């Protein structure tokens, strides 16, 4: 007989829950396909 | 709306989408630099403003009077002329409306698209957007039912939020 029982499986397969805080919430994306991305600033200013 | 749910999650939850980056680069090299796509826009813009509309839903023709007189400044031809001036340039138009009452809304102003951003947010259509002059920000909001932002779109067949603009394809 004890061939003739068989556990039941899960539904799905789960896993660990890993957090998904990322800085990319606060962070600035840009949709940018070209192979970089360039960014300007100014690190000093004029004078008056 | 069911496909709301994945599609805004990846594009990014409430942050402003900022899209074309060649914009305005393609206005001022392509209708103020060539006379081609100066006259085609200009051709389409006052011919569109040109054609009479009419009130059907109402059982019988006939905000007529909303349409004629927009605003202080510009005039019924003024304001199409600027509409589709925005969708044959960047392919989407905007249209503000100011409503201390409660119905049929006093102005219309056309909100130039390039100063302009779309917001998607947690689920479906955008929730707000962005009127972005200088480094100042506006965030009109679309969590209600009257809407205060038209957004007309030209078709794009990649992107979600914005239209393609046949300049872009002319480029």
Known sequence: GGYLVDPQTSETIRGVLRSTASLRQIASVVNVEATSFDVLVDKTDMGS | ?171
């Open chain 2, 1 to 171: 709306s069911v496909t709301g749910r994945i599609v805004a999650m990846a594009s990014g939850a409430g942050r402003p989408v900022w899209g074309p980056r060649d914009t305005v680069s393609l206005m001022r090299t392509g209708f103020a630099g060539n006379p081609v796509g100066f006259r085609s826009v200009k051709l389409i813009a006052e011919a569109t403003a040109a054609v009479p509309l009419i009130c059907q839903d109402a059982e019988r023709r006939y905000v007529l009077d909303l349409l004629r007189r927009p605003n202080a400044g510009q005039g019924r031809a003024e304001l199409f002329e600027a509409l589709i001036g925005q969708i044959l340039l960047s392919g989407n138009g905007y249209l503000e409306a100011v409503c201390p009452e409660p119905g049929v809304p006093r102005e219309l102003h056309v909100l130039r698209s390039d100063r302009m951003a779309v917001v998607p947010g947690a689920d479906g259509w955008p929730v707000g957007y962005d009127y972005t002059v200088g480094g100042r920000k506006h965030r009109f909001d679309m969590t209600g039912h009257p809407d205060p932002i038209c957004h007309i779109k030209s078709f794009h067949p990649t992107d979600d939020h914005y239209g393609l603009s046949p300049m872009q394809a002319a480029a």
